[PDB]
Amino acid sequence: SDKLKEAETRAEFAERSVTKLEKSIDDLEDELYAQKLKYKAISEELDHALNDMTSI
Amino acid sequence: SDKLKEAETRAEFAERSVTKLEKSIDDLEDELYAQKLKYKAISEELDHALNDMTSI
Amino acid sequence: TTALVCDNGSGLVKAGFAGDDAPRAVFPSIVGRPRHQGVMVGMGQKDSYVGDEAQSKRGILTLKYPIEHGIITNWDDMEKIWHHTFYNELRVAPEEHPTLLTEAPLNPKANREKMTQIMFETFNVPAMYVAIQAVLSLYASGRTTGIVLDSGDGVTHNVPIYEGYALPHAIMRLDLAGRDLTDYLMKILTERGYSFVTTAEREIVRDIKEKLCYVALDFENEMATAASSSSLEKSYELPDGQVITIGNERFRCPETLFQPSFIGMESAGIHETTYNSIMKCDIDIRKDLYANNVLSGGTTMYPGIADRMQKEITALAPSTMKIKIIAPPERKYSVWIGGSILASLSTFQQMWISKQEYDEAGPSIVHRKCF
Amino acid sequence: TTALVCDNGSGLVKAGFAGDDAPRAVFPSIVGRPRHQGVMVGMGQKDSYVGDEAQSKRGILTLKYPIEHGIITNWDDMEKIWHHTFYNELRVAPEEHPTLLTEAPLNPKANREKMTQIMFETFNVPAMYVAIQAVLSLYASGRTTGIVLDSGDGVTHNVPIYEGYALPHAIMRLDLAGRDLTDYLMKILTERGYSFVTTAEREIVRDIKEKLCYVALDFENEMATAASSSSLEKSYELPDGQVITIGNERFRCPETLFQPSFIGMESAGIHETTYNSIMKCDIDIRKDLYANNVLSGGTTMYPGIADRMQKEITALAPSTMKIKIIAPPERKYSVWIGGSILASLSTFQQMWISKQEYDEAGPSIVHRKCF
Numbered sequence: 001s002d003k004l005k006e007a008e009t010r011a012e013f014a015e016r017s018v019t020k021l022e023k024s025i026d027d028l029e030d031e032l033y034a035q036k037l038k039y040k041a042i043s044e045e046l047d048h049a050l051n052d053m054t055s056i
Numbered sequence: 057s058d059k060l061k062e063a064e065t066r067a068e069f070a071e072r073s074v075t076k077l078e079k080s081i082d083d084l085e086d087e088l089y090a091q092k093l094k095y096k097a098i099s100e101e102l103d104h105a106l107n108d109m110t111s112i
Numbered sequence: 113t114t115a116l117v118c119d120n121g122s123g124l125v126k127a128g129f130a131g132d133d134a135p136r137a138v139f140p141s142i143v144g145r146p147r148h149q150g151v152m153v154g155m156g157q158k159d160s161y162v163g164d165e166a167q168s169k170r171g172i173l174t175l176k177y178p179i180e181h182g183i184i185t186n187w188d189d190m191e192k193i194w195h196h197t198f199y200n201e202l203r204v205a206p207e208e209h210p211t212l213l214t215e216a217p218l219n220p221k222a223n224r225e226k227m228t229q230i231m232f233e234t235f236n237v238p239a240m241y242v243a244i245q246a247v248l249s250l251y252a253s254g255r256t257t258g259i260v261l262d263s264g265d266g267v268t269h270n271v272p273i274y275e276g277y278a279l280p281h282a283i284m285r286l287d288l289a290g291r292d293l294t295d296y297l298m299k300i301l302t303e304r305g306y307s308f309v310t311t312a313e314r315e316i317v318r319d320i321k322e323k324l325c326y327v328a329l330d331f332e333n334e335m336a337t338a339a340s341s342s343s344l345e346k347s348y349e350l351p352d353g354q355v356i357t358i359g360n361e362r363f364r365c366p367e368t369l370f371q372p373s374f375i376g377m378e379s380a381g382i383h384e385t386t387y388n389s390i391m392k393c394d395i396d397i398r399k400d401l402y403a404n405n406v407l408s409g410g411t412t413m414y415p416g417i418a419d420r421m422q423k424e425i426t427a428l429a430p431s432t433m434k435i436k437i438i439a440p441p442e443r444k445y446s447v448w449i450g451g452s453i454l455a456s457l458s459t460f461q462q463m464w465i466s467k468q469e470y471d472e473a474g475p476s477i478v479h480r481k482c483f
Numbered sequence: 484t485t486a487l488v489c490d491n492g493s494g495l496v497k498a499g500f501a502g503d504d505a506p507r508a509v510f511p512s513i514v515g516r517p518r519h520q521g522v523m524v525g526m527g528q529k530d531s532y533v534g535d536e537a538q539s540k541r542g543i544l545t546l547k548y549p550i551e552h553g554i555i556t557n558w559d560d561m562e563k564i565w566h567h568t569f570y571n572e573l574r575v576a577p578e579e580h581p582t583l584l585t586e587a588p589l590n591p592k593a594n595r596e597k598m599t600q601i602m603f604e605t606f607n608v609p610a611m612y613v614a615i616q617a618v619l620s621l622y623a624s625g626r627t628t629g630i631v632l633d634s635g636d637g638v639t640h641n642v643p644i645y646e647g648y649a650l651p652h653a654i655m656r657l658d659l660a661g662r663d664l665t666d667y668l669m670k671i672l673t674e675r676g677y678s679f680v681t682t683a684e685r686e687i688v689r690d691i692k693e694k695l696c697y698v699a700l701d702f703e704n705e706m707a708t709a710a711s712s713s714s715l716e717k718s719y720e721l722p723d724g725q726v727i728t729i730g731n732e733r734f735r736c737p738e739t740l741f742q743p744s745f746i747g748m749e750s751a752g753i754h755e756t757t758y759n760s761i762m763k764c765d766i767d768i769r770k771d772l773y774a775n776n777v778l779s780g781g782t783t784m785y786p787g788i789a790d791r792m793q794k795e796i797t798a799l800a801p802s803t804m805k806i807k808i809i810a811p812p813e814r815k816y817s818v819w820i821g822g823s824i825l826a827s828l829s830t831f832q833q834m835w836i837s838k839q840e841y842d843e844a845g846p847s848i849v850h851r852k853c854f
């Protein structure tokens with residue numbers, strides 16, 4: 001019974017830790033998505049300036 | 057005994073999941089760092105262009 | 113009250129209240145019924161997604177434009193598009209607003225009469241007026257003369273105007289436009305391995321055409337350069353990955369405008385139908401038309417067309433005349449801006465086709481004095 | 484009244500009233516006649532022990548599953564199983580309860596028609612409805628899109644769904660499942676000396692597979708490690724003592740899923756039939772299917788499969804798309820939870836096949852509008 005309690009406690013902590021890690025990776029994935037949007041927008045604006053200048 | 061085996065299996069599963077999640081988050085952080093490096097490089101090139109345009 | 117300046121177009125419906133700078137709501141004019149079976153219950157699946165909603169669910173729809181070449185081929189779908197435009201994109205009931213539709217030149221009468229009958233019976237507007245799509249584009253430029261080439265997505269027409277007096281015998285309407293360029297691009301992409309067939313993938317090819325294609329200043333030199341170097345190959349990422357590389361398909365797609373023999377059409381390009389439209393005019397207003405050539409419509413947004421066209425016309429025209437091509441940056445919405453200006457005029461306020469007039473003469477009122 | 488959400492399955496029958504979280508009674512679907520002679524008189528020996536009773540007397544029985552691969556091969560035994568399920572595990576007479584069976588995709592028609600004929604004639608239910616086992620598993624995840632890989636014990640099928648519209652031309656049904664993995668494990672255990680032959684000992688091998696086997700993240704590295712160290716050898720105590728030690732048989736048994744060449748099957752693994760099922764879909768819904776890959780069914784409970792499958796698909800798929808594999812902890816009962824949710828819906832309440840309808844059109848009603 002004592003060993004079962006110990007193992008259950010460690011497994012519960014492991015579940016909590018993996019939940020925290022999954023939330024953290026969600027946050028960082030969202031941040032990378034935002035920065036990818038930033039690069040898309042800046043490249044699009046540079047292309048717009050290029051086409052405006054080449055087309056007067 | 058059945059409960060102990062269940063708990064042990066749960067612990068092993070959660071530990072492996074946490075290992076995979078840690079490796080994945082580190083890799084994604086590396087990718088974000090690389091894209092930020094590219095953005096900074098082109099931004100410095102544009103800043104040089106602006107420095108010259110100050111003379112324009 | 114304020115007037116509704118709708119502009120059916122063919123490919124993008126542009127609408128908004130009179131007196132502004134830009135249309136309030138711009139969205140593709142496509143109505144797509146779902147084609148698969150559907151297993152989830154209670155998902156709230158509608159029977160037809162119109163407008164910009166069907167450009168997001170296009171993976172499981174069969175989009176079909178209700179306007180083929182200026183003319184309207186499917187009246188129920190067009191009615192659905194108008195109902196959506198009035199109620200959901202502007203949220204103004206039509207019972208309290210005049211409307212100003214636009215129509216290409218030389219279109220069938222029945223199309224215009226059915227349009228006015230719908231607007232007066234179904235939507236029950238107070239008064240509607242139909243205007244030629246080129247006069248508005250001439251309004252927006254702030255000119256009063258000039259020959260305007262309005263190369264839309266359905267049909268390209270070239271209406272010359274002098275001192276406000278339109279010349280009805282010199283209108284040259286050609287049915288090559290953006291849609292045929294999309295089909296030709298989709299047909300020449302197959303030379304590298306990329307096959308687009310579904311009516312949904314036509315939208316992807318349209319996006320490729322918009323973002324990458326450009327008009328070459330000199331065609332043979334570009335064909336020679338693209339066949340030796342590789343400085344032209346621009347890549348593009350499909351909606352799922354697998355980037356593609358467009359080589360000399362870049363300037364071959366919009367070249368069809370100046371050589372309609374590519375898609376098998378007999379007629380001459382947009383560079384020579386303008387000169388022919390000028391030469392049909394009288395001998396004393398040709399200088400002014402030469403100097404005030406106006407471009408409009410979406411398809412004239414290709415990077416580098418205002419130089420190719422000027423070079424071609426200068427080659428054709430006499431050496432003494434000055435050739436100038438007006439290409440405002442707001443080309444796409446030029447017709448709608450002109451429509452707003454026309455609807456905002458006080459002198460125009462008595463030209464609307466009032467409902468009592470329609471009740472007395474029937475739908476054939478549009479061909480009468482109220483044009 | 485309440486509906487009975489039965490789920491025949493192949494290996495475990497799961498049943499319970501609609502609107503709960505978990506099935507009320509879960510028990511193996513085996514019917515085993517005794518095989519020896521029997522000398523005690525008056526012991527009350529029955530002629531066939533079904534369900535969970537035959538997993539305790541399995542020492543003197545010959546268990547035989549009535550469902551081979553989704554299809555039902557022995558109708559009398561299946562009728563016996565259903566009778567047991569209704570009367571002894573739930574204790575509710577079927578005369579007062581609608582039923583919602585489940586069926587694998589692409590199954591023979593005669594199986595479904597016989598199922599409905601039995602339910603309407605023998606048990607005499609008020610109304611029954613048959614649903615595809617993958618749509619329910621998609622219900623349980625609370626999604627409305629996604630491609631679900633439901634690797635049961637009989638048959639593994641992979642149904643892609645978008646926005647509630649199932650794609651019937653992209654269903655890839657493969658007949659490798661948990662039973663073949665049990666047989667292959669029983670066949671490779673003989674390489675150490677342990678021979679299991681009797682149909683009763685197949686249950687022991689199944690228990691070994693459930694408790695010990697796991698899916699390797701990388702196969703060659705694990706094969707190399709297990710051949711040098713001894714950190715993998717896990718022991719297990721048979722129902723009579725004589726512990727056994729499983730070496731590299733641990734991850735070789737479930738590896739058959741990703742390399743069906745081990746058991747001589749030609750087809751590609753579950754890692755590549757999902758990618759093929761995606762690629763048959765339209766080009767505009769592939770991103771959503773990539774991001775919402777759903778796992779279900781019992782056999783997808785191996786420790787470490789949600790990472791191996793993601794690695795494989797990421798290797799196959801384009802580098803830009805994000806690959807995400809939904810693996811809820813309640814995987815085993817996902818189909819039944821979805822069945823309960825579907826039966827609890829108000830919009831679904833008029834889709835049942837009412838008995839008067841069956842009386843008018845015969846058993847072939849199931850293929851008709853009431854699917």
Ligand SMILES: Nc1ncnc2c1ncn2[C@@H]1O[C@H](COP(=O)(O)OP(=O)(O)O)[C@@H](O)[C@H]1O
Pocket residue numbers: 120121122123124125263264265266290291294318321322323409410411413414444
């Ligand atoms: N930026 C662009 N570059 C190239 N072609 C464009 C661009 N924008 C629009 N087009 C083409 O023009 C068409 C839209 O033309 P539009 O003026 O909206 O037609 P309409 O006269 O029916 O409103 C699109 O189908 C597209 O093919």
Ligand SMILES: Nc1ncnc2c1ncn2[C@@H]1O[C@H](COP(=O)(O)OP(=O)(O)O)[C@@H](O)[C@H]1O
Pocket residue numbers: 491492493494495496634635636637661662665689692693694780781782784785815
């Ligand atoms: N915890 C587990 N680990 C590994 N395999 C399992 C586990 N539980 C069940 N299985 C396998 O899955 C099968 C049960 O699958 P199930 O989903 O009940 O099939 P069905 O779709 O017929 O209900 C069993 O035969 C067993 O081989």
Ligand SMILES: [Mg+2]
Pocket residue numbers: 121122245262264265409410447
């Ligand atoms: Mg137009």
Ligand SMILES: [Mg+2]
Pocket residue numbers: 492493616633635636780781818
């Ligand atoms: Mg199942």
